[PDB]
Structure formats: structure tokens, C-alpha cells
Write a protein that binds this ligand. Sequence first.
Ligand SMILES: NC(=O)C1=CN([C@@H]2O[C@H](COP(=O)(O)OP(=O)(O)OC[C@H]3O[C@@H](n4cnc5c(N)ncnc54)[C@H](OP(=O)(O)O)[C@@H]3O)[C@@H](O)[C@H]2O)C=CC1
Ligand SMILES: c1ccc2c(c1)COC21CCNCC1
Ligand SMILES: c1ccc2c(c1)COC21CCNCC1
Lengths: 512, 529
Amino acid sequence: FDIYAICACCKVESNEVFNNYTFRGLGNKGVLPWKCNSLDMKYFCAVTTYVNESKYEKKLQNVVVMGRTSWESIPKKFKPLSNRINVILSRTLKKEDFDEDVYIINKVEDLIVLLGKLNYYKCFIIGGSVVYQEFLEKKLIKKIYFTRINSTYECDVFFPEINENEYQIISVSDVYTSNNTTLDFIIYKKEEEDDFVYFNFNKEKEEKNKNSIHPNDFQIYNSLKYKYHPEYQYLNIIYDIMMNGNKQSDRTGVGVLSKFGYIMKFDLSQYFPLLTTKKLFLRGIIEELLWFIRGETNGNTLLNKNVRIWEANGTREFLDNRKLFHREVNDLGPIYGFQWRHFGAEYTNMYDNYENKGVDQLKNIINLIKNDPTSRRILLCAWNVKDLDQMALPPCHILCQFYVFDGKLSCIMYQRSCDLGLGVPFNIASYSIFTHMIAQVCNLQPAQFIHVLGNAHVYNNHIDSLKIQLNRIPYPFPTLKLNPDIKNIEDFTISDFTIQNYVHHEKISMDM
Amino acid sequence: QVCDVFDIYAICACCKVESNEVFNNYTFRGLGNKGVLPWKCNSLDMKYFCAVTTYVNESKYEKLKYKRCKYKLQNVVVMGRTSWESIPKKFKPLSNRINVILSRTLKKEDFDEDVYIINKVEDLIVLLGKLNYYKCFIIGGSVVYQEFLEKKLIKKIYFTRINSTYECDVFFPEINENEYQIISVSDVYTSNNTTLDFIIYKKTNNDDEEEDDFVYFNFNKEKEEKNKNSIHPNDFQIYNSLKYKYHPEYQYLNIIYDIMMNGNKQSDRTGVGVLSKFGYIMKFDLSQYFPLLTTKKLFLRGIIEELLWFIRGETNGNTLLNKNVRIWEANGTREFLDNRKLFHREVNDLGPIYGFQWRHFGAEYTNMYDNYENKGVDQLKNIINLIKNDPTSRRILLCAWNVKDLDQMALPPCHILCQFYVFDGKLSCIMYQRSCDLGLGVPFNIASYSIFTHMIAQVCNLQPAQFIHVLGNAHVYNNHIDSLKIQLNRIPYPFPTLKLNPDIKNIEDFTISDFTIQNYVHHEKISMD
Ligand SMILES: NC(=O)C1=CN([C@@H]2O[C@H](COP(=O)(O)OP(=O)(O)OC[C@H]3O[C@@H](n4cnc5c(N)ncnc54)[C@H](OP(=O)(O)O)[C@@H]3O)[C@@H](O)[C@H]2O)C=CC1
Ligand SMILES: c1ccc2c(c1)COC21CCNCC1
Ligand SMILES: c1ccc2c(c1)COC21CCNCC1
């Protein structure tokens, strides 16, 4: 045969449980719910008007089976769909009641009777509330090329549920922005080569591939053919460490799997990389970032806002094993906050007015982005080697470095100690926000947030949790709204931060 | 052409022979000495030799059985008779292979299995038109290799380069560049105390639905190829002509290509002009080689004195100038210190740079003559005590970027930090470089921190594993383009080895003589202008 569908589906207007079905809304008043989508249009056009030279025998053009439902909706300029063999499932009207150089049908089976008689490459099913429906009910559809507009609109029609048992995903594209929404494209479904083998003559065998994880558990992960969604930069590092990672016991007498040296790149112009295979929260961490800009080392400011990210490191007992016997509870010492605004100054306590003592890097980096964008000395370093001893712990995040090309701002953050299961997910969120923040106050469009992992580890009792995680297919990323009016780094407040269209899988306890 | 039909291939291993130096592929030719191998065993050369000559793919047979007609599956090894008698007997005949011997002085009627016996080339064709075999490998020795190539009967060659020198009496014959081009070069390994690599030469011309989707998911790609920077990739014939570029130098070369083809056009401070990208990782296995670029000449005396200088804690430019190392000469002149607003700084007093920070971070810099005794943090001593006593720590860092001192320094550090990592008494090292001159600087910086990782690894009684290099601002200078183009069409030679003098057990106690770069084989020096 060679029959395929191809839909575009947004989310429907009326705690929320998201699932594949979330994305159903197909039409609103005989048109799309969204007024236009350039990138979706282009994808659909490239898909439906591509033909491979060879692959026939086993010009040459594709079929596009729409219905009266759909056909009529299309303007006259595009019609009859450029470079395609159009077809129209209408009971109502015959070839006598239409203009263009089309073919008609009436029954579902009268497509079989037309197709067995025709020259083509591939057969695409373009649209119809019911034109998808009865095609699934009559197991006729091989793959579904399915676009997810990751925003919410009013609709009157849907796309029918999809049987987990009948159809499964085998490809997830890169995530894009276009027409002020994110979207991605997925696929549902029912002599110099032996040279490769010779060059692999020295790798692991079959039971030497270090670690006692299982294939059987990663059924759905190992299945996916193209893993181009950028959440897979995180997921494949979980998969690299799990399978190839060195077993170490640490300081505490616990147990991790560790590798050394990874780099993730996230394009903030196209999405906000808030991992989608588990629920994440950003109030906790946006408030940590504001606390940093304000220059605080005061455990209490965060505790009183029920941000407990540092509670553990402020206790009488934790400071005392650092040898900080002269340190008030929740006085974390010269940490992120102090080093950013007062680097070099002598630290006294967390209450002291430090104004105009030390190096205000944050101001410096910002003036350098504005004054000298082509500089290669735009670093923000929290690892003061004089003050490490004095900190409740040394910075986990060593440095941000900045790059400006064509009014556009990228950011590498180098991390010395990466807990892949809990921390990294938040860490990717934090320095992403900061990059938007610095971009806005510097009149620049965010480009890539770039994350270098040093000691990258997965804790032994996060593993069953992460297996569950690897086997969940990423949803399209959300977007981050910064209040456009804010234009100094100190003038930001929690309410200037909005996450739009966060579609996500169920919460997971990395634990127990 | 006869050999395409019967898939007849050559496989060989060649060392460098007993006699500045010129180096071509004709450097590697040494085949055998006194009817044995010039090296004792290799082992990995053996394992590679075993895997290839015994590798069979039973699906891809039928296409080749069809092809041969028109003109437990096993390969055929073809062998001169003295190469046969070099084989140690407990290994005769070569297991899981059809052994063919080539002799005039011996026949069928005096072996004991051991083989098929033939007495002529066009006599092997007889057998291959008759036999059930996958591919046919010609394993030598010299007299065989020779008569097989001058007959245009070899379709490719699986040439191992044994990057050491041994006594030789039989050689592989000069390959002609016109008849054979290298399509593929492999990872470098260390085996029985030599670097070695694997290269393929090729005879020149002088569910399959997982296929469309790629094209689809590729819809929004920028390049149909209105080439994004004015580089004509038809100037990189050889670079693009290689199928498998697995040599670890291709990690440096590949970045030059990524920057050349994809860089952002920027101009700097002085106006000089660059193409830039942000953020690369290179990893090198120091256990398997020493990553000193082979696509041009590099001297290490300068960068080694510098590293010893840093460890001594010095900041005196004179000390290096008095050893004819001019690295920091430009950064210490009245002129340069003056534009830095360091008018109260003596010429060649460069200030609180690498040496100072490693030995005395957070001390107040006075001058290059102040001995700063027990003043500021001795980081280097700290990282050496952390690796010995605290290897599981994720806090074993050394940082040269002291925000407080940046303006007092002749220039800010390019090598922000090193972080060490210790699994199973092996020591990996990561270095973050804020700014990266790919054409001039990064080559030395690769060798510089690889050299340091070895030094730590020795004084902490550990073996060196990975040198990991993180690039941030990665830029090729517009003047380095032509030269880097030339360099990209040179095929890397196997990396040399670095031997430190093993009596050194203190980081303080290394001296220029305690450092030996053995078997540096390389293309000729390129001026980047
Ligand atoms: N580096 C590497 O990869 C390899 C190294 N070697 C080394 O090479 C050396 C052996 O090579 P070399 O000295 O050239 O000897 P060969 O292995 O090439 O054998 C030569 C002998 O093979 C027979 N022979 C060769 N060609 C023909 C022909 N066309 N027709 C009939 N008989 C033929 C003759 O045997 P007869 O005397 O009975 O007439 C001849 O004397 C050793 O030192 C060995 O270790 C060997 C192979 C691979
Ligand atoms: C009729 C049929 C199909 C379409 C339209 C009308 C409008 O845009 C699409 C093509 C692009 N994907 C979305 C749907
Ligand atoms: C006969 C034929 C070939 C060989 C030998 C004997 C000894 O080992 C080699 C194969 C591996 N490279 C070295 C040469």
C-alpha cells in the first residue's frame, strides 16, 4: 500500500494530568484554532511533496487524501494542493460539483479501488474530524506524522484517541518556536562498512559493557529511532553513566556511578529546557537566583520564603564539621551571593553592610556585555580559593562565561559536581533563567545556555526512578515570560517570572 | 579488474627502519628481520590482525557468490612460505581461516594439513573461483606483497603503523599515491611499549523505512550550500575524502573545520578579525598516546620550562628569557604593561599570574622578587594532598582566575582551572579555556596540560587517563585560514609517547631533562601567516 496520516494538534480550552491525548484540537469554525503556523505549514509541505528516486520500484508524486470536511476550508490560491494528487471523501458532491483537476471517492474502500489503479510513491491523509476516525477504526494507517502546537486555543473538533496497544512513537524531532508558540514533530507506527567492524575490534564484548542495568527495562528508549528532542541531551547522559559509569563510594560511605566531562547545549531562542519526563518547580530556584543578585549569604531570607535549598548546610552540626565553629546558623559564609557582588572583600557575618567593598563582578560582566560584546573575559566566577574554607560548602557551579554575536547572548556554566538525578534538572533551569535575565537587562536576545559537566554522577538509589524516566517520551518544552519592563539585574522580583505551557509527565520520587 | 570480484585484500604491519628529518608514509616500511618480526610480538596488532582476517558476515555473501559466477563461512589467508615457517606451530594452521601457502621448493606432499599449496599467483584465482570463502586477505611476506601489488590485484591494504624503530632486513614496498589513497585512519593505541594506529588505503580511479524521516526531520536545515563563510571546501579534497576519521587529532582538526565552515565573523580589540564559536570538549587518552599535533611540527622545550616556572611559583619573565623562551616577552614590555595601566610595574614583572595563584592565591602581590613564604593558599600542594588522601572528592580543583588580581596581571589567564578525577588509581584532568586560538595556541595548550596531568599522576602514584579540554570562546584568526587549510589535508601520523623520569616523587623536583617525547613523527612546520 504505503498509506500514512499527518495531523497538527493543539491543546483544548475548557492539578491537571497531561498525557499524549492532551494534543487533540484540530479545527475551530471550519478553520484551524491557530490562525497560521509557518514552520508546521513548511514541514507538512516538505513531507507531502518529497519523493525518493529509487524507493518506488519496490514526475513521481505523493497522494493527499483530504475530505469535504477539509478540502473546502483550503483557500483557492493553494488549491489544487501544488504538486500533489488530491482526493476528496464526500458522499454529498461528485466530480460534476467541483472545479479543479481532482479525483473523488465515497466509501473508505473506494480509496483502495482508486490506489490499486494509480502511480505514486506515498499516500498521505491530510484531515477531517471523521476522515482520521474511520481510517483508524479500519486499521489503514501505517505511521502518523504528528505536530504538537504547545499552546491552548478554542476548538469544535478533535483527533481521535490513539491506542497505546495499537500505535507507539518511534521518533521525536527537535523542538522549535514559530508564531509565538513552541511545537515539535513526532511519528506514530503500528566495502567501507566491514571497515567499521575492524575499527571497533577493541571495544567491550557483550557482558563487559560495565554496569548491571538491563536492556529489557529501557524497552521504549532503545525503540526510538530519531531522538532529536533536546531533553535527550540530559536523558542520554543518564543512559551513558548508567551503562558505562565507574562505581565509586563517596565521602558519606554511600554509592554512585560517575563519568567525567559532558557538554549540553540548549537553544533558549526556540524553548525553555524544563525537563518534561517529571514534574519540576521553579519558585524555589528563581528566589535562590534573586538572593544571589542581592548578594545575600543569609540562610534565613530563603527559609522565611520556604526555600529550603540550603537548610541542610546551615545547621549547627553541618557548620561544625566544616570547622565553622564561629558561624551563626544559616550564615552560609562568602558563597554565590557575596562572591558575585563583593569578591575579594573580607567576610565578617551575613548582616554586615558590604557596600563598595570587593569586586562587583555582576556589574562588571553586564557593563562588559554592553560596552565590549566581543570580549573573551566576560566570566562570573564564584570559586574564590581564599574563601572556600569559610563557605558552608564550595560552589557547586564554578563559573558562567558569556559570548555575544549579532545582538545575541550565549552562556557556558561549568559545574564541578553534578548529581544527574536531582540537581542537574534544576541547574539547567537556573542558569537558563539567568541567561534570559542578563540578556534582557543587556538588550540582547537569548541564544544557547551551554552546560559543562565535570564529575557527573547518578546515585545508586536514583537508578530504578531514572529507568522509569528514560522510557518516557519528552513533551515539547514550555517557554519563559520575563516581564519586559525590568532592565536592571536588581529590579527583578518572583512575579516577573511566568512559565507558559509546561506539559509534563507525573512527579517521580528519585527515591524509595 | 580481477580483485573486486574475488575481494582480494592486503594486510600488513610496518615499523620505522634504522637510518632535521623528512617524514612521509614511506617512513613506515620495516616488515621483518632475520625471518621474524622486528618487534617481538605486538598483541593489539595481532588482535586487529585476528579480528579482520577471521571476520565473516554471512548475509553479505550471496551478492558476492552471484558476482563471482557471472565472471561456517571463512576467509582465505595467502602467505609466502618463509612467513608460514615464522608461525610458531602451536598456531599452525591459522585457526578459523583457509590457509593458502605459496612455494616452489615444497608441495602438497610434505605439509600435514597446514594448508592448500600453490606455486603461482594465477593459481590462487583457480581456487577462489572454486572455493566457499568470504574475503581473501594477502598476509605477506614482502616477496608476496610485492608481486601482488605490481599485478594490480589488491583492492585495499590494512596497514598498521608501529610508531617505534627496529632492526629490519625486509621492507613493504613504496605504495604509489596515484594507485592508492588513504580513505580511513583509526584511534591510536599503546601496546608492548609503542604507539600504533590502523589505516586503510583504497585503489583509486586513475526496516529500511528509517530513511525518509531523517530527510523530513532535516526539513528546516539552513545549508543547501550558499557556503556560510567564503571557504571553498573543494580546497579540503583530502579531509572530506576520508571515510572514517577516528585519529584523536581529528578532534582538533574537526573544530577548525566547524569554526571555518560555521564561525561567526567577529573583529577584536586590535581589529585583527576572527571566526568564533562557543563551547567544545576534546578528550585524549594519555594511557594510549601523547596528543602532540602530527599535522605540523611542535617543539615542547618552551612550554615545559613555562610549566616548571608556574610550579616554582615564579612570575619573573627574565627567568624564561634567560632560557630563550619568548612566550611571555610581548606580555612584559614597558609598552604592554603601560596600556594595561601597570605603570608602577617593572618590565617583565608580569604580576600575579599562574605561578603566583597556584602557590599563594589570596596573598597580596608585591613583586616578582618577593618570596611569599606561607602567604595565601598553596592550591597545587592542596590538589596533590586531595588526590592522595581524598580521591572521591569532587572539589579537587586548581584555579588561576583570581577576580581580585585580574587587573594586576599582565593579562587575565586563558586556562581558568583544572579539575582532577580519580577512578581505580587512574587520574583524569579537565581544563576550561575561556579564550582559544585554534591556529597557534590550542596545539601547545593541549601538550601543556597533558604534560601537567602526567606530572601530577606520577607524584600521586597513579596512572594518567584522560586529558579533557573544554573550549569556550573558540576562534580561528583570519590570517591562519590558508595555513589551517593546508594542515587539514595532512593525514595524522600516530601520536608519540611522553616518558617522565620516574625517580621524581615531588611536584617541585621535575627538571627539563626529566622529560622525553619519543617517536614524534610529523608533517613539516607551518607558519600560520
Ligand atoms: N609485518 C608484517 O605484517 C609481516 C611480517 N612478515 C615478515 O616477513 C618476513 C618473510 O617475508 P619474505 O622474506 O619476503 O618471505 P615470504 O613470506 O614472502 O615468502 C617467500 C617465499 O614464498 C614462496 N613464494 C613467494 N612468492 C611465490 C610465488 N609467486 N610462487 C611460488 N612461491 C612463491 C617461496 O617459497 P620457497 O622458498 O619454498 O620457493 C619464497 O621463497 C619474515 O621476517 C616475517 O616475520 C611476514 C608477513 C607479515
Ligand atoms: C487543509 C488541510 C491541511 C492544512 C490546512 C487546510 C491548513 O494547514 C494544514 C497544513 C499544514 N499543517 C496544518 C494543517
Ligand atoms: C605470518 C603472517 C602474518 C603475521 C605473522 C606470521 C606474524 O604476525 C603477522 C600478523 C600480524 N601482524 C604481524 C605479522
